[PDB]
Scaffold this active site. Structure first.
Site, PDB file in Angstrom:
ATOM      1  N   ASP A   2       5.657  -4.968  -3.587  1.00 37.89           N
ATOM      2  CA  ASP A   2       4.541  -5.369  -4.447  1.00 37.89           C
ATOM      3  C   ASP A   2       4.435  -6.991  -3.674  1.00 37.89           C
ATOM      4  O   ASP A   2       4.869  -7.963  -4.015  1.00 37.89           O
ATOM      5  CB  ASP A   2       4.765  -5.708  -5.887  1.00 37.89           C
ATOM      6  CG  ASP A   2       3.568  -6.195  -6.521  1.00 37.89           C
ATOM      7  OD1 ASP A   2       2.326  -6.492  -5.968  1.00 37.89           O
ATOM      8  OD2 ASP A   2       3.559  -6.738  -7.860  1.00 37.89           O
ATOM      9  N   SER A  32     -11.516 -14.175   3.261  1.00 36.52           N
ATOM     10  CA  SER A  32     -12.474 -13.321   4.224  1.00 36.52           C
ATOM     11  C   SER A  32     -13.623 -13.757   4.694  1.00 36.52           C
ATOM     12  O   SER A  32     -14.026 -14.552   3.855  1.00 36.52           O
ATOM     13  CB  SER A  32     -12.631 -11.719   3.439  1.00 36.52           C
ATOM     14  OG  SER A  32     -13.431 -11.031   3.983  1.00 36.52           O
TER      15      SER A  32
END
Ligand SMILES: O[C@H]1C[C@H]2CC[C@@H](C1)N2Cc1ccccc1
Length: 330
Positions: free
Chosen positions: A35, A199
């Site tokens: 994770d 992004s």
């Protein structure tokens, strides 16, 4: 040193991926959920409340000649989705794919929540976010990667998750045969303890690319892609009959639909998520309503590039003094 381990989807939907991890001496192999959005290595154990164990493999520290109680240390973690666990702490030898760390904090669960008990395939989590998020008190502990870093050939790990198939976690090297083209690296902020990056935009299907900054985290422990409501609405508007369902908890779509791809930007590069990666199947057995793999982050507080996005790429988690992320197509 290096390590390399195969990671395997737990079910036919790729809801999560499990990676075998050797703990203790002799080794006890547990299948952990790696994770990158958390920083605790915790396991089902001989100390877990018996009614909360249902098929998981447990770590028994009393059977490990290298286990040592970390005296006074406790841990307690609450994840983004409301799942939780807590317990005490041992140090022990932990190996992943041939890479060994001695003295790793292994957090033994005394209590776990219903989603953990129901996941019989998941024996615990191995956190790979920054150690500043580790919950051990009163002495915070380091992640497996942090402990291994100095010994690694290069201070990196890579995630190569499969679509409906196994993939690979590598530590200490970048497998140049595992991706196509070049890796585009992008800046990381560690201010929230995550692999947080920005992004450069998105496209839906064959549509034009929208240049827009989308801050989010690279999180292997989250199944889906959670993005701003504007972006998510633009995606699902291209699927006839798709709608957000308050009762189901997100966007659903007719199982008869063919889904468009979704592209996200990494600098000037582009990662394309095929439409099929966005299908999470019937909302209940036999239903013709299917759950979408792109969902709104509006109720979270952060955008999350979970497995739906990451499995479309070869992802480099560069843990150099100034960390960065790399993405390549594959
Ligand atoms: O109720 C339990 C927990 C969740 C939800 C249904 C099933 C059993 N598990 C699927 C799942 C596992 C890992 C990651 C995401 C989803």
């Amino acid at each position: 040193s290096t390590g390399s381990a195969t990671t395997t989807p737990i079910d036919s939907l790729d809801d999560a991926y499990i990676t075998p991890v050797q703990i203790g001496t002799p080794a006890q192999t547990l299948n952990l959920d790696f994770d990158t959005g958390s920083s605790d290595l915790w396991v089902f154990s001989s100390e877990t409340t018996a009614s909360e164990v249902d098929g998981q493999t447990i770590y028994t520290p009393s059977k490990s000649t290298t286990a040592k109680l970390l005296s006074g240390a406790t841990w307690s973690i609450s994840y983004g989705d409301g799942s939780s666990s807590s317990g005490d702490v041992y140090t022990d030898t932990v190996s992943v794919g041939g890479l060994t760390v001695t003295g790793q904090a292994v957090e033994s669960a005394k209590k776990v929540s219903s989603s953990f008990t129901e996941d019989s395939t998941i024996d615990g989590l191995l956190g790979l976010a920054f150690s500043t998020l580790n919950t051990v008190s009163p002495t915070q502990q380091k992640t497996f990667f942090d402990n291994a870093k100095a010994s690694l050939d290069s201070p990196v790990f890579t995630a190569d998750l499969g679509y409906h198939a196994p993939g690979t976690y590598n530590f200490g090297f970048i497998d140049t045969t595992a991706y196509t083209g070049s890796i585009t690296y992008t800046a990381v902020s560690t201010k929230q303890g995550f692999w947080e990056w920005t992004s450069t935009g998105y496209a839906v299907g064959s549509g034009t690319f929208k240049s827009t900054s989308i801050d989010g985290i690279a999180d292997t422990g989250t199944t889906l892609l959670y993005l701003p409501a504007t972006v998510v609405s633009a995606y699902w508007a291209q699927v006839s009959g798709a709608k957000s369902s308050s009762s189901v908890g997100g966007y659903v779509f007719p199982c008869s639909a063919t889904l468009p791809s979704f592209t996200f930007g990494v600098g000037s590069a582009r990662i394309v998520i095929p439409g099929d990666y966005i299908d999470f199947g019937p909302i209940s057995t036999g239903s013709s309503s299917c759950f979408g793999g792109i969902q709104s982050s509006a109720g979270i507080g952060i955008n999350i590039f979970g497995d739906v996005a990451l499995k479309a790429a070869f992802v480099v988690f560069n843990g150099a003094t100034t960390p960065t992320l790399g993405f390549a197509s594959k």
